[PDB]
Amino acid sequence: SSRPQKKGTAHHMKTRPKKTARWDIKRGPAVYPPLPPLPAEWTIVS
RNA sequence: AGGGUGAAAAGAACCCCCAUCGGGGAGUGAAAAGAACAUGAAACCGUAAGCUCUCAAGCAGUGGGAGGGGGACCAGACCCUGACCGCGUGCCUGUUGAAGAAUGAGCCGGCGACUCAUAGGCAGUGGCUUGGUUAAGGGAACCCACCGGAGCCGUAGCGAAAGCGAGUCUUCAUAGGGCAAUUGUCACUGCUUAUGGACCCGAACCUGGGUGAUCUAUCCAUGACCAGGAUGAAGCUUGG
RNA sequence: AACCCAGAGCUAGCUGGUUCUCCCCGAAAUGCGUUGAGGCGCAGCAGUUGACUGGACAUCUAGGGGUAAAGCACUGUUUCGGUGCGGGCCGCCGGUACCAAAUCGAGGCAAACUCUGAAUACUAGAUAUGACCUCCAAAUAACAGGGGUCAAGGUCGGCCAGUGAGACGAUGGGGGAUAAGCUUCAUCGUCGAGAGGGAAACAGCCCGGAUCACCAGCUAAGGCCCCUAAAUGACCGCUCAGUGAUAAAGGAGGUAGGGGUGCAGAGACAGCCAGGAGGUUUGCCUAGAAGCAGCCACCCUUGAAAGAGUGCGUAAUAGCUCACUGAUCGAGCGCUCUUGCGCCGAAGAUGAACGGGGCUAAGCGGUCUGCCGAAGCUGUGGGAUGUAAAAAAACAUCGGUAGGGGAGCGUUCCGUGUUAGGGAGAAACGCGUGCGUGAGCCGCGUUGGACGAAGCGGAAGCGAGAAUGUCGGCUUG
RNA sequence: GACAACUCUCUCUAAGGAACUCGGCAAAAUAGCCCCGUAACUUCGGGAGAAGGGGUGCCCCCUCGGGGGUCGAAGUGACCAGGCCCGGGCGACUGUUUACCAAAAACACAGGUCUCCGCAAAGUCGUAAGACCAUGUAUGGGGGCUGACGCCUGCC
RNA sequence: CUAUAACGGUCCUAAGGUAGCGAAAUUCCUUGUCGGGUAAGUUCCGACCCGCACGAAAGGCGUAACGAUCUGGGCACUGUCUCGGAGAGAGGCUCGGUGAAAUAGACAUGUCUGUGAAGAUGCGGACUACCUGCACCUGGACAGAAAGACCCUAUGAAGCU
RNA sequence: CAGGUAGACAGUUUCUAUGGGGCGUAGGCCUCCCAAAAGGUAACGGAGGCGUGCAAAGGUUUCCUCGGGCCGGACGGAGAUUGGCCCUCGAGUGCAAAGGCAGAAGGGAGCUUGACUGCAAGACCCACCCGUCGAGCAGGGACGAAAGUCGGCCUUAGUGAUCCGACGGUGCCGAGUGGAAGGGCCGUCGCUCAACGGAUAAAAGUUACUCUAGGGAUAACAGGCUGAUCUUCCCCAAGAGUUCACAUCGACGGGAAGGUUUGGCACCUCGAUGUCGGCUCUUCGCCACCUGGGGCUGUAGUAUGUUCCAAGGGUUGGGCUGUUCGCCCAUUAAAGCGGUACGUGAGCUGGGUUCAGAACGUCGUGAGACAGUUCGGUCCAUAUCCGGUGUGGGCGUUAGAGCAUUGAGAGGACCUUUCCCUAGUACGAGAGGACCGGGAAGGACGCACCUCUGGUGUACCAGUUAUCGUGCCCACGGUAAACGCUGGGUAGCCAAGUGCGGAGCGGAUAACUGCUGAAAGCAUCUAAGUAGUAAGCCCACCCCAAGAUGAGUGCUCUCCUA
RNA sequence: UAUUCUGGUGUCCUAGGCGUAGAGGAACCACACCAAUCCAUCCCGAACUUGGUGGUUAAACUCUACUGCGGUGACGAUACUGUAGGGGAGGUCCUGCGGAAAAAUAGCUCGACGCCAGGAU
Numbered sequence A: 001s002s003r004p005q006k007k008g009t010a011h012h013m014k015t016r017p018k019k020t021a022r023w024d025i026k027r028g029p030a031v032y033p034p035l036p037p038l039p040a041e042w043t044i045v046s
Numbered sequence B: 001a002g003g004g005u006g007a008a009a010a011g012a013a014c015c016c017c018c019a020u021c022g023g024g025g026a027g028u029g030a031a032a033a034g035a036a037c038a039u040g041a042a043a044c045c046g047u048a049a050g051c052u053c054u055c056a057a058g059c060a061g062u063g064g065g066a067g068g069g070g071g072a073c074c075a076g077a078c079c080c081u082g083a084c085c086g087c088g089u090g091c092c093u094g095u096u097g098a099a100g101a102a103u104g105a106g107c108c109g110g111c112g113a114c115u116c117a118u119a120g121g122c123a124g125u126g127g128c129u130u131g132g133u134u135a136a137g138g139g140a141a142c143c144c145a146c147c148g149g150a151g152c153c154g155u156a157g158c159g160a161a162a163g164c165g166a167g168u169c170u171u172c173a174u175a176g177g178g179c180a181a182u183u184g185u186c187a188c189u190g191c192u193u194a195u196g197g198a199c200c201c202g203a204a205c206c207u208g209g210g211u212g213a214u215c216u217a218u219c220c221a222u223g224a225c226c227a228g229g230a231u232g233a234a235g236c237u238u239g240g
Numbered sequence C: 001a002a003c004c005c006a007g008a009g010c011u012a013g014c015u016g017g018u019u020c021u022c023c024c025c026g027a028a029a030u031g032c033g034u035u036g037a038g039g040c041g042c043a044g045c046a047g048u049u050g051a052c053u054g055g056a057c058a059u060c061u062a063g064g065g066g067u068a069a070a071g072c073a074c075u076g077u078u079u080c081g082g083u084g085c086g087g088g089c090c091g092c093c094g095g096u097a098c099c100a101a102a103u104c105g106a107g108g109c110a111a112a113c114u115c116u117g118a119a120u121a122c123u124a125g126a127u128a129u130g131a132c133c134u135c136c137a138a139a140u141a142a143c144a145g146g147g148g149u150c151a152a153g154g155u156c157g158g159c160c161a162g163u164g165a166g167a168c169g170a171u172g173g174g175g176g177a178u179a180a181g182c183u184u185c186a187u188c189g190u191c192g193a194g195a196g197g198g199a200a201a202c203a204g205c206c207c208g209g210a211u212c213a214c215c216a217g218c219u220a221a222g223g224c225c226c227c228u229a230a231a232u233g234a235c236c237g238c239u240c241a242g243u244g245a246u247a248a249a250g251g252a253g254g255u256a257g258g259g260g261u262g263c264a265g266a267g268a269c270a271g272c273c274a275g276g277a278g279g280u281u282u283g284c285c286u287a288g289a290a291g292c293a294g295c296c297a298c299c300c301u302u303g304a305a306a307g308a309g310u311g312c313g314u315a316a317u318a319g320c321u322c323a324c325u326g327a328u329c330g331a332g333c334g335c336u337c338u339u340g341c342g343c344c345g346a347a348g349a350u351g352a353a354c355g356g357g358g359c360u361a362a363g364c365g366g367u368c369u370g371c372c373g374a375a376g377c378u379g380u381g382g383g384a385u386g387u388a389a390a391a392a393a394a395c396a397u398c399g400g401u402a403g404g405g406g407a408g409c410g411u412u413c414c415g416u417g418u419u420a421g422g423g424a425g426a427a428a429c430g431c432g433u434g435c436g437u438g439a440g441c442c443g444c445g446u447u448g449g450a451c452g453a454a455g456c457g458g459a460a461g462c463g464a465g466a467a468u469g470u471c472g473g474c475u476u477g
Numbered sequence D: 001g002a003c004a005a006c007u008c009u010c011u012c013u014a015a016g017g018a019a020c021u022c023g024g025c026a027a028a029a030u031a032g033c034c035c036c037g038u039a040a041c042u043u044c045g046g047g048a049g050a051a052g053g054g055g056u057g058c059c060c061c062c063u064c065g066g067g068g069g070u071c072g073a074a075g076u077g078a079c080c081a082g083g084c085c086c087g088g089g090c091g092a093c094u095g096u097u098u099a100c101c102a103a104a105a106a107c108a109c110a111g112g113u114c115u116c117c118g119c120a121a122a123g124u125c126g127u128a129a130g131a132c133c134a135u136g137u138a139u140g141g142g143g144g145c146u147g148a149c150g151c152c153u154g155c156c
Numbered sequence E: 001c002u003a004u005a006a007c008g009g010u011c012c013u014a015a016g017g018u019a020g021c022g023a024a025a026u027u028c029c030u031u032g033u034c035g036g037g038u039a040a041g042u043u044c045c046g047a048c049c050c051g052c053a054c055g056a057a058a059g060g061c062g063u064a065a066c067g068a069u070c071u072g073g074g075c076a077c078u079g080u081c082u083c084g085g086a087g088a089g090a091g092g093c094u095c096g097g098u099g100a101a102a103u104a105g106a107c108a109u110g111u112c113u114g115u116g117a118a119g120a121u122g123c124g125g126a127c128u129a130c131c132u133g134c135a136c137c138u139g140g141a142c143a144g145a146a147a148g149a150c151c152c153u154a155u156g157a158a159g160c161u
Numbered sequence F: 001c002a003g004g005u006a007g008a009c010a011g012u013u014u015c016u017a018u019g020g021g022g023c024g025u026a027g028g029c030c031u032c033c034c035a036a037a038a039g040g041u042a043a044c045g046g047a048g049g050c051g052u053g054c055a056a057a058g059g060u061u062u063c064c065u066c067g068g069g070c071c072g073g074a075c076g077g078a079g080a081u082u083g084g085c086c087c088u089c090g091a092g093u094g095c096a097a098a099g100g101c102a103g104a105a106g107g108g109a110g111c112u113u114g115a116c117u118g119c120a121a122g123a124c125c126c127a128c129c130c131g132u133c134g135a136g137c138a139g140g141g142a143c144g145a146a147a148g149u150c151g152g153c154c155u156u157a158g159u160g161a162u163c164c165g166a167c168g169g170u171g172c173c174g175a176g177u178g179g180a181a182g183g184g185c186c187g188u189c190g191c192u193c194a195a196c197g198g199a200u201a202a203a204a205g206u207u208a209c210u211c212u213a214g215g216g217a218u219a220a221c222a223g224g225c226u227g228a229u230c231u232u233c234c235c236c237a238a239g240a241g242u243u244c245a246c247a248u249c250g251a252c253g254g255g256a257a258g259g260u261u262u263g264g265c266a267c268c269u270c271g272a273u274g275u276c277g278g279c280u281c282u283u284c285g286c287c288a289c290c291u292g293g294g295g296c297u298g299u300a301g302u303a304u305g306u307u308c309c310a311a312g313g314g315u316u317g318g319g320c321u322g323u324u325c326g327c328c329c330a331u332u333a334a335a336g337c338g339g340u341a342c343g344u345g346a347g348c349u350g351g352g353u354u355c356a357g358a359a360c361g362u363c364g365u366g367a368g369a370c371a372g373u374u375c376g377g378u379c380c381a382u383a384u385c386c387g388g389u390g391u392g393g394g395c396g397u398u399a400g401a402g403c404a405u406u407g408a409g410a411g412g413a414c415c416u417u418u419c420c421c422u423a424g425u426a427c428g429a430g431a432g433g434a435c436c437g438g439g440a441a442g443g444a445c446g447c448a449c450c451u452c453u454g455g456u457g458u459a460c461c462a463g464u465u466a467u468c469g470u471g472c473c474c475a476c477g478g479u480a481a482a483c484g485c486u487g488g489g490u491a492g493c494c495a496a497g498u499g500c501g502g503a504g505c506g507g508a509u510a511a512c513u514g515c516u517g518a519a520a521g522c523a524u525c526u527a528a529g530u531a532g533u534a535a536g537c538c539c540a541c542c543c544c545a546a547g548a549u550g551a552g553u554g555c556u557c558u559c560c561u562a
Numbered sequence G: 001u002a003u004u005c006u007g008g009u010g011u012c013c014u015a016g017g018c019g020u021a022g023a024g025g026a027a028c029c030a031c032a033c034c035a036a037u038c039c040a041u042c043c044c045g046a047a048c049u050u051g052g053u054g055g056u057u058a059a060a061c062u063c064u065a066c067u068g069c070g071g072u073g074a075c076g077a078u079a080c081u082g083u084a085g086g087g088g089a090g091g092u093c094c095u096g097c098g099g100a101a102a103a104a105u106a107g108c109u110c111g112a113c114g115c116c117a118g119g120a121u
Ligand SMILES: [Mg+2]
Pocket: A001, A003, A004
């Protein structure tokens, strides 16, 4: 055998998970319409 | 190495277990503090009561908490236990890097290491700045009032030096260049530096002075010892 | 080179150890010199303190250069070609198809070659508000400006540290075997000194830099059959090898596609029927060579077609069969590439060993949308440090080893003090639904039996888990 | 007490007989006494207990060893008590030695040879005084190398 | 005749190894080659000489006797062995009495494989495993008994030349 | 007092990196490359130089152009001197290399001494110490008509801090004062201080007699990484093989795997994590030595050759070695190769770490030394845990028991050689001589066993020696360790003795051989579907076995009294 | 003031150079010829020097023209690369955003600009 193996960090570089697919990279958080302005949390009644 | 019964031996009569020791009562005493006696932590050894483990894999915990128990007054809380699920590669040292199969610690409690003196530098605080300060020494014993200006720091530099001096050395030349044309000090506290063992513990050694020949190495004096058996040199006498 | 004592706490650039808490900042493993290499001096890069400053992050322009690429103008190198002085062999002063400089033509190569020559990098200059609340303009919005606050780089010094064994990864290279988790340099990233998520586990790969609380929310990297959070989602293609965990040359009617080129409707491929002749037994060679041991030639004729013969066969013939042609059959078929995914090549030593179970998708490409996913970001509350000099209110900030700075707690003792308090129970010992960022404090006792706080100050034999420490006590076996 | 494995101190083991093993390590074997016999080799002393063989108890009889009988599987019946032979190296020999991992081929040795020393000697120990050498005197005393006996000991 | 070299030439030294021995306690290559002993011989004996690198008082070559010497072979003999067996004692084992030690971070202390400072009970994935004794066995725990004798360092120590 | 002179004696020194051994080599400076177009930059990376030289090779004024082709010219030739045309920087420049430089920095001529004194703004380089460039100013000059140039050299190497001394100068100091001695200052000289930032003026070895503190920051073994070397293949096919590349070989080259050889690395442990052989004891891999089944053959037969599947079993006994290796003897079916830390040292034992003694050869003056040889030479261990082989208790198994079993799972064993029928039949001209299927005897191994043959048999029985007891004879007893010594021996235990075992027209496969048969109207062992077939795999055989917590099923028994 | 021409003299530059063909003699520049007291040749009045002649555009220089050589040289695209990733056992390949050659060809090129003296218009 004239080929080596992948030890330690080398091996990590090779084997770590990646999304190659151009479509999954370009995804993102959903865009939800804004919320109507909400009331005051707690009010003091005197 | 081995300290502390009580104020006082009042150190426990008498009965019981009973060969003695040891104990349980009674009695002494504020207390038994009962002679292995004063406070009496930890390791370690147990005894009892509450919950719980015998299909289980785990640096023993932690977040969640089934079921069961306990002392409450803010009874929806606290405390003990712990069905099962999740997460969780002892500590130190030292390393590019450790859970390491890298070193170190059996466990528990004590002892155990940047100290002191004196100087130098710097910082922080004061005191004086009619410059600052005293050293040894003297002191109603110490401390301390009051002394003690000898010293020391700051007020002029340049130059090897004579020497000159707000200048001076280098120069034929100030022509240029160099260096100068100003500055507090005495304490206390801290950080560092230096000198002494100088953060602690740890060598093999080095030298000086003694002590050893009852062991062993040689010898010296004077004693003692070596069962039993073989073999048969010289020499000597016999005779060719 | 005895022993004991003394100098002696010898000396040890070496190894081990060096004890309370919280807050802020925070490295280096490089260069030079060294009887130096595991030490040290200075520099580089901490911290704290002052003095000057005006930047940094971006944007554009300008400089010089000789790397990457490229090239043959020089220096080498090199192949063949053209021409050839120059040499070898022969003759007798005669011959040739033999080796060869320079130049030409063609074609290359180069760390120590350059007529050329980038990108970045370096040096320099010039252009441009970092955010947030307010005032605001008849005034609303926005814009403009005033005002206020905050954040942000650098040189020179003072005081005073560590560091001077680095590791891998990306990239450029040298040594080595374009071997090594090897080694040695250069520009960077992470680890060192960095927790969290993804990587089955997994210093150095990817995301992200942890003030703290929350049984809230949105996301990054990465994921969505069950173990195990989210789609047993959607729509296109592919794979049949459990490929989906790894390796090459090479092999191949594997398979799904794409592109050229042959033919054909007077019938193309395969099958089946027949023919496959004459010269001639071609010449040579040979005992023989007759298509078929070997050598050379490989034409011609009759023809629908038939090679002086593709293979078998004979001692040599014969014989079988192929190339090619007519017929039959009636719609595709030939030989070429080339992608994608597979197959074989592919074989080790304790036992599935490639996360498991499993899956023809739960594998692989391509496209669409939901969700999960961290200590990142948001939400709601507390703390601290810097502005900063009381607050309060802002804004920013708060990972951290070596290491530096700030703020504290506790122990014994002294001053106040022959203190307050204490046989109406001190110290100590044991406890706490008490209060602190912690060191700890405050309170309580069916223990204990005589001392002794707080405050405001002072001093140290002042804090222990590590020293094969050390002395006692007690285990384990 | 019991009578496992295994270890150790011991006895025995069919057929074989060193095949074991680094190596016959350890075991087994031999063994006294009397009688016969006894090699190479030699420094003529040895070798030599060479090797190898026979006999052995208890009774009577004869002579002062011999004959006859008789038991036993076995008679020096236990204990005690040599295995031997053929070779080679090294060292002549008996001796000495590393207390506690080495007993030898190392050390010694008789012998050899060199050299110093005439006596108030050389040599050794003492700062010195002096002591040893030696109450000796070159057939003696120091020191160096070699190592019986045999053959020798070459060149520079 | 292949060969070898008594014999010559030259070189250099103070001079160039004579007698005797020789694969040896000396021989590297090397288990030299030959002969013997053995069914088979890296040892042994004899001889060759090509003495890496014998040699003449650091003695050379012989040698009878001697040796708890080193080394080869042979007869006798045997559990040394083929290939183990049985027995006796002292332990081991049970019961009563007395009663240690080295060791020890804490240990609730499986296997395979993978990972990892590159050989894991302790991290991952599977697999296997009721709790706990006793007798035996010694593969592991990088098992235990402190400076690693070997290698390097130290401007260490000592002895010796 | 002086000179000489003994490691007899004393104190000390003996560098760093080599390949972390000897040995010689290297250590400062300069140029080029590496060096990634600023500068800087390492390697035991690749090339070379320097430790000076010139009185002109310096200064200046002024003039000039080298080299290389081709041609002419007495000797004279390839090449000397001379003439001429073409190319234009290819020569030169004291000496390396680099960068420069053509009416020049290159060649010549004339005059010289600036190869000056006093200096110096500012820069570059920079840890420091050093190092480099320099406009400008004054003095006194050289050359030049003058402008101007000149503080050595086209540039970059040609060097050495400090202390100390030496010579020449000097308006300085001069220990009461005057002088002197001696010093200061300026100029300069003196080290291969070359280990070149120089430790002193002055310095080598050795330790296996050794020791201390440390680290393996650095090796020796093993582990890991790597795989050059090694081992096993595959690709191409020049040929060989009567014809014929591919029965069998396969040159020139290529592509791999493995991790067993010799290595590289230094990640690993240094304290007591240690190499090669045997003994005992396993176990696993397959690249298959034999045994089972096949394909091809240049296979007639027997026997081969090569290759495919196959690791269930097997793989002897000796002479020789420290050995891995290897050689032989006699067998054998065959006497396989590897891994497991030499697999195995808290299981055993030899060497090896050649420890201290000694001797030989050799090196060294020497102490001593040797990957030379030789003789001698101490490794301990009561098992805590895991792991194992056995053997119990507890508890579970849903009321408690006693028996009998099913069998998930686990193991043991299924091995092999001759000979004889078949048949001297096929096969072959003969010589030779089968496949297939039957039968016996053996081997090894396993399971038992004691009838026989034995071994032991300290239960016993007999002889017998010495001796002391029982009063003495007789006869017995003790002792001669754990039989005094011998001769026998039953039961037990045991083997060399005796038996027995290895069975399967069961199941499913590997290779291979096949039948029907498409995709490609042909063919094809395969795509559908099936048939044969292996010492292999699984059931059957033999023991264990419901803690098989999934704790099974069956039969029976017992649950009183108040 | 212009313009044209000759000679001198510079600066800028794309470095204007060689070749072929043509033009210039009144002026200007040059050679040609002749003689050597200043000076001159390592030999030579060749060069350099002083003083004459009056010949010629032959050489030289000058001016116009021309791509044959020479010099210069794109646009595009490609190689390379900065940064953000991806593939491969590796040697090395690929993508996005930004920069961007060398070579080769297409073209360009027979310089530009200024002062002085001297003629001519
Ligand atoms: Mg490999």
